[PDB]
Amino acid sequence: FRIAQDVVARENDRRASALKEDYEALGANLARRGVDIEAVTAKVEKFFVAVPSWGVGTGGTRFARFPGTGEPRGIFDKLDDCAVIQQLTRATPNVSLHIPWDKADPKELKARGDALGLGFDAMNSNTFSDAPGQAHSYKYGSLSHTNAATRAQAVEHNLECIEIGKAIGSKALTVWIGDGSNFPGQSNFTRAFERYLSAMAEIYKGLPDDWKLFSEHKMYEPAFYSTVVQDWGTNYLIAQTLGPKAQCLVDLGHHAPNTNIEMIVARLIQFGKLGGFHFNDSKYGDDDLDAGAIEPYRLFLVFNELVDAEARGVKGFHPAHMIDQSHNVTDPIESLINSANEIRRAYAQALLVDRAALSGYQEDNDALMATETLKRAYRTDVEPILAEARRRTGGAVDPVATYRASGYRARVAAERPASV
Amino acid sequence: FRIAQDVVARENDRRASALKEDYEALGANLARRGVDIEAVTAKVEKFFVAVPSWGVGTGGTRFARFPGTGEPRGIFDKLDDCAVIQQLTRATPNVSLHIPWDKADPKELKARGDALGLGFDAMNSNTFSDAPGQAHSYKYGSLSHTNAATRAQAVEHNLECIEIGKAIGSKALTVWIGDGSNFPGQSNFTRAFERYLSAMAEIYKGLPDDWKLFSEHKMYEPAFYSTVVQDWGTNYLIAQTLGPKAQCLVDLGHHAPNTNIEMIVARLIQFGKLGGFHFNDSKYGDDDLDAGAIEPYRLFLVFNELVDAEARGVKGFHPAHMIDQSHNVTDPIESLINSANEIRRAYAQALLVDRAALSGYQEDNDALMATETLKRAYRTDVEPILAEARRRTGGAVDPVATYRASGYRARVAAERPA
Amino acid sequence: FRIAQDVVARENDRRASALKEDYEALGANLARRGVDIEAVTAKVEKFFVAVPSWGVGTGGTRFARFPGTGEPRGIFDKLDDCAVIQQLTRATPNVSLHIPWDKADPKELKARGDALGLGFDAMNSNTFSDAPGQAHSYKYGSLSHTNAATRAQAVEHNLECIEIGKAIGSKALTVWIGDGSNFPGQSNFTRAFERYLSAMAEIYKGLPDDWKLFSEHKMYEPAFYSTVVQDWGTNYLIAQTLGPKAQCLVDLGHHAPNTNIEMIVARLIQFGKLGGFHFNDSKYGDDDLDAGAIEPYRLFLVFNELVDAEARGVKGFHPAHMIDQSHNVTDPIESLINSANEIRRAYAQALLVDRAALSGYQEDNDALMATETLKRAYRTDVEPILAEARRRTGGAVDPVATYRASGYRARVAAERPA
Amino acid sequence: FRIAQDVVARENDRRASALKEDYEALGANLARRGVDIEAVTAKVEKFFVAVPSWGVGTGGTRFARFPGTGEPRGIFDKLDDCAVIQQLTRATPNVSLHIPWDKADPKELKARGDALGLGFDAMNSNTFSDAPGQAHSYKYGSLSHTNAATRAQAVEHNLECIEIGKAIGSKALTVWIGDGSNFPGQSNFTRAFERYLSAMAEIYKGLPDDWKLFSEHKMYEPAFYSTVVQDWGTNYLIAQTLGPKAQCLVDLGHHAPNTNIEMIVARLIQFGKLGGFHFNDSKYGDDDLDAGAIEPYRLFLVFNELVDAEARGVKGFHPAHMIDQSHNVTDPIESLINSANEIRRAYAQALLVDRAALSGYQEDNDALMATETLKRAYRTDVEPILAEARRRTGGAVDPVATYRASGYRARVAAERPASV
Ligand SMILES: [Zn+2]
Ligand SMILES: [Zn+2]
Ligand SMILES: [Zn+2]
Ligand SMILES: [Zn+2]
Ligand SMILES: [Zn+2]
Ligand SMILES: [Zn+2]
Ligand SMILES: [Zn+2]
Ligand SMILES: [Zn+2]
DSSP: OOSOHHHHHHHHHHHHHHHHHHHHHHHHHHHTTTOOHHHHHHHHTTOOOBEEGGGGSBOOOSSOOOOOSSOOOSHHHHHHHHHHHHHHHSSOOEEEOBTTTTOOOHHHHHHHHHHHTOEEOOEEOOOSSOOTTOSSOOTTOSTTOSSHHHHHHHHHHHHHHHHHHHHHTOOEEEEOOOOEESSTTTSOHHHHHHHHHHHHHHHHHTOOTTOEEEEEOOSSSSOSSEETTOSHHHHHHHHHHHOTTEEEEEETTSSOTTOOHHHHHHHHHHTTOEEEEEEOBOSSSSOOBOTTSSOHHHHHHHHHHHHHHHHHOOTTOOOOOEEOOOBSSSOHHHHHHHHHHHHHHHHHHHHHSOHHHHHHHHHTTOHHHHHHHHHHHHTSOOHHHHHHHHHHTTOOSSHHHHHHHTTHHHHHHHHSOOOO | OOSOHHHHHHHHHHHHHHHHHHHHHHHHHHHHTTOOHHHHHHHHTTOOOBEEGGGSSOOBOSSOBOOOTTOOOSHHHHHHHHHHHHHHHSSOOEEEOBTTTTOOOHHHHHHHHHHHTOEEOOEEOOOSSOOTTOSSOOTTOSTTOSSHHHHHHHHHHHHHHHHHHHTTTOOEEEEOOOOEESSTTTSOHHHHHHHHHHHHHHHHHTOOTTOEEEEEOOSSSSOSSEETTOSHHHHHHHHHHHOTTEEEEEETTSSOTTOOHHHHHHHHHHTTOEEEEEEOBOSSSSOOBOTTSSOHHHHHHHHHHHHHHHHTTOTTOOOEEEEOOOOSSSOHHHHHHHHHHHHHHHHHHHHHSOHHHHHHHHHTTOHHHHHHHHHHHHTSOOHHHHHHHHHHTTOOSSHHHHHHHHTHHHHHHHHSOO | OOSOHHHHHHHHHHHHHHHHHHHHHHHHHHHTTTOOHHHHHHHHTTOOOBEEGGGGSOOBOSSOBOOOTTOOOSHHHHHHHHHHHHHHHSOOOEEEOBTTTTOOOHHHHHHHHHHHTOEEOOEEOOOSSOOTTOSSOOTTOSTTOSOHHHHHHHHHHHHHHHHHHHHHTOOEEEEOOOOEESSTTTSOHHHHHHHHHHHHHHHHTTOOTTOEEEEEOOSSSSOSSEETTOSHHHHHHHHHHHOTTEEEEEETTSSOTTOOHHHHHHHHHHTTOEEEEEEOBOSSSSOOBOTTSSOHHHHHHHHHHHHHHHHHTOTTOOOOOEEOOOOSSSOHHHHHHHHHHHHHHHHHHHHTSOHHHHHHHHHTTOHHHHHHHHHHHHHSOOHHHHHHHHHHTTOOSSHHHHHHHHTHHHHHHHHSOO | OOSOHHHHHHHHHHHHHHHHHHHHHHHHHHHTTTOOHHHHHHHHTTOOOBEEGGGSSOOBOSSOBOOOSSOOOSHHHHHHHHHHHHHHHSOOOEEEOOTTTTOSOHHHHHHHHHHHTOEEOOEEOOOSSOOTTOSSOOTTOSTTOSSHHHHHHHHHHHHHHHHHHHHHTOOEEEEOOOOEESSTTSSOHHHHHHHHHHHHHHHHTTOOTTOEEEEEOOSSSSOSSEETTOSHHHHHHHHHHHOTTEEEEEEGGGSOTTOOHHHHHHHHHHTTOEEEEEEOBOSSSSOOBOTTSSOHHHHHHHHHHHHHHHHTTOSSOOOOOEEOOOOSSSOHHHHHHHHHHHHHHHHHHHHHSOHHHHHHHHHTTOHHHHHHHHHHHHTSOOHHHHHHHHHHTTOOSSHHHHHHHHTHHHHHHHHSOOOO
């Protein structure tokens, strides 16, 4: 236990009356709306989202990285911090690894995860940066590089990510590369895409029967003119061409300005190619900010589509969700905790939508009442639901508050010497 | 001849000397670069782009419309003006009609075209506005409207466009609707798209083998929250789903800010779904401005993908090129003329690209030289070639100058009600 | 009374039981946060936003207009509909008129307003479209047109607006123009701005001592390349140059993609040039959609700045708020009603912000808690406070429901032509 | 000479014939247009743009950095590299330093400059990153930070930059900070701006009589929610508040999507607050790509505004232009060489515009001929002019090729230690 259980008990107990009071008042409100709070809380308790191992360390920009105290160094420190998030929120039982950043003895990794109450989600390859001793540089690309040997090296690396994953209980490989161009003419759009497809096919072959291969699109950065896997369009083409085990990941901040992202999610669901959604928020580009800190309604609308599919069924709908953020000015553990909270909030509110009435208003072209139908769910403060769900599953009523009272940050600060 | 042949001759002779000097100098420059200027002029003389019948009249915004003098009244006046663009540029031999705005007797349309020296490009259906006497309003959609009757009506209108088209020489149906929503929840994305797909399939059945069914995506406007056919991604799903004769249409100004459009072009070409282009320029949204008036380089880069397609030997690749612009503050004829000129300008520069050298710099990851290889073609002032091509084919060295020296605007201003 | 009072009371009783429960519960919740739900309600009852006389009529785009039943015709019909919005929501006691659209005997407008329980807000001049019998077209601009006569005509019209407003009680003139260019070179940015400044100076001279002159910026549309008053930066230059009675209007959907609108509001407030805010919502451009229907948090954040201004004790702060929306796919009356409610919602949420706690987290750079302090206020469902505010002031608990139960649309649909 | 003269000579002679044919042809074409080419060349050979010392090193993103061979070791190697750019383009006689990065004995900096034929442009302060031993971190800001001692520390640093500048011949301080917030509520917008204005006033107070203070706006990055100096509006307010010596710097890639940047330039000129223009090119955000590589027409339109200023007779307009770019996938020296060329290219075309005819078309609202009048200039290939200008001033007819023929990169690669 990273956080002392008595601390959690103590903090949860001092707030129990306040929680009960809010949970009952909201229950009566929902009752009058033909909604059983219990059924909502039970689904909220089972909604999980994978945490990225690299998310608990302080992020930065090309201009600077301002570390806080107790920076986790290495996958072990990182797992230890991810455990706090899971313990207090009970919404992140699985961690997503990144190779080579988190390379370590498989057996040791698994053992550490099991001891912490954490599992492992999709593996993440890295061919957007060069590692020491690497024979071929990825400066000009990897899987789509013009040099065959470089592509081969990129493919072999992704294969190794699978072998590591197979050994720790993982069932998928996410592939996000920087590949693209910064100048017009630098790359031949079609030929680079062909090279990419060809290299991905080889990785696809190394896929066990129960594994999936996720490709992630991004409009720009690190490439500033063109990017091989630039949008969900190219992303769909990829998934369809690779096969059944290949699907597309939709990362909120990876789209052009004003893009209707929730429609992209619905389009992928329909054609059974939505592998999963990567949560974060943005205002300008791929800001990788805390989920819901900028546009919480947008987040709700995305979840509205997920819930529609989750309820109405849909062939091939088994999303692998993950938070992908950079925490440059906050305590990384606190931001991930509140972001996971935000993700469950949007989920919970999506569950309140009256699907029948909505469908009626859409059929009648009653736009005002259709949008109002969503707003009724969205405007609902489901915090008591999120907190109770946490309380019933070993979590903290108020995660951040509990995390602060535990002095966890100061503790790892004493154990982890900083640069200065 | 909408324009007096003597006016054309006078204004050409007035610029002949200068064109000879410019053409020979560029000819010499290109020879040093290993390019035969005659081979380019020959290709430029063959590049054509369709003019929109509805682009010959002054356009407007939701705030106002400020018509100029001699506004065309009806499709026949419009064809008369389109003939001027063709006569002077020799690059716009085909007119794309819009129904029901251009509804008229087929035989007459065909005859007028033949007399003016104009053919007919793709037909354009219109279910994004209610025509008088219409049974069902498209207020809430057409091909994807929730009401079955409204959808059938829209389907029927599209089939009718095909009938009118067969009788006048058209070989394609362009489908662009405003279908979408302005509010979250108003529509169910998936079901709306399913309806659209079923409707389009019905239209596909009635599509002749010598025709192409072009669907056109747009991010927003008229719909401000979501649009059924919002981007090329959906456009590809549509075309793929519909059949070998269904292709995607790419309108330059119909994309999200900063979208790399030339890549969209390359992607569609690779999967054989690039039906054609709708040229125009923009800076903010779907501004429908004169081609290359805002970003001429982007226009060159789009054409760079087109010229590369041919070089890479892509089979059956014959995209239909059409200009889709609104002229709110200029003489629609001059704009269209210069827009067509700009399009040909971009194409000619693209032809100057040293494909071998570019391929070499791309393989060796010499980004600087690869970009400079494109710039060397783009920086070349190809006006001499554009002017010569026009001259050798009956056009004007300086189209707009000739157009103004004829007093055509004043003329039709006196023949048409103000 | 446009809406039968028996209906208003019947629909309120029908929901009076559920409301009391929700109200008491929120009251209890707020008390635990050290907030007296009555003080909040008291201030919400006093928050007003003006309604545009042109907003009650169905809006459209350059592609089509899909009118509904009983479309109002003329100012008097529009005032009748605005009265409904005011009666049910009690948040729109003032109407903003637009000339020449609403030109009519001032004495009559004044009387009809007093009878309907409506006042008149800022006047709106119209030089972005031509009226019949107009001597000079505004095709190429109005207050900044190169033609002196045209600028003079634009100035007189605005002066005329001031006069009509002086007779009906208005205290401000709002000037939004389309003036700009669609092509590079068409306008000399500086010369054009100079002309605008000089002309606005003349309109300023016709301002009574207690009036305000509001200049409204807009990035683009109808001008697609450049706009004389393109952003708040240029807007500030205008207000600072004209004088103390000149201020800037910030319209939500008139900004570039991703712009931080709330910072703009704060900057203008800091320098005393925030004349007022124009509410609506958007996703792509100047969509003019219902306020908060797309991005409610942004709406809330704008109000957070408005509320903080009072908290810091900004002197002379009296913004003239107004709704500026286009309703193309819903009953205009219904949309304006929910827009006004959404506005009050953001306002009430802004009031719930624990300023002491917030400044505390800002001071010690506790970003996470600072942002959570806002969220605690924003996430709070204040509908009961809004519904209770309307009930106590003669409005409806569920305005749109009451409106639909009254059958008002069918009524005016019968009294008015199709 | 960084580049041997026999090489520059040989390469020039190799291209003399083609240059002669293209220049004389163009000259004739211009004569037929009523333009004397010699007059353009004479103005072109005197147009200078300052080069950033931090631009001759390979740049990177927050994802990776892929250095090339011969990366400059310190400021002295960097000046050496800038000397090559100057020798070959003859368009970048001045270098802009960045403190503390370029810290060194002012006497030695000045001496190396004079020795290489380089002058020093605007000084650049750095409070967007933490240098060793600071009493306070700029993590949450610098000049607008809530902590008084932190702001005082940033102020002092800027004053030190001025002292170094005065010792080496600089006449200005460029201030660009990262200050802002990544979360709504994190900063009180107004309080932060007030703190920034007060602090900047103190820096202003340290300005010599003939120095200028340039404040540079930027929409986002590193801050992803709000930025203190976010746009030209805020920038104008700053310059007007500080005084006559304070002006605004306009960096191309620092504006929101679709922004009309040329108008901004016009607006700042009209009110006398355009201190200078930082050149680069972009497509998505602050891409910092080679100038004119993405949108050459927009570059031309910016110059059109600069030149129209002289046409309208603006007095005392002497803007301080600088290139501010990041070269992640090219030889920095080559990218800087071609960017400088592109800038002179756009400047030359702007000089070719028929202002007389243009003012006529603007007055009678002939939109079409007005736009075509600019195009007739922009479409003109002025390369021959740029090349001749370089030949006349000791530069190379084709800088990049001459640079490659010299083998300068391999030479410095064998002299400079790669970081380990
Ligand atoms: Zn991701
Ligand atoms: Zn990302
Ligand atoms: Zn189109
Ligand atoms: Zn269009
Ligand atoms: Zn407005
Ligand atoms: Zn507007
Ligand atoms: Zn800069
Ligand atoms: Zn920058």
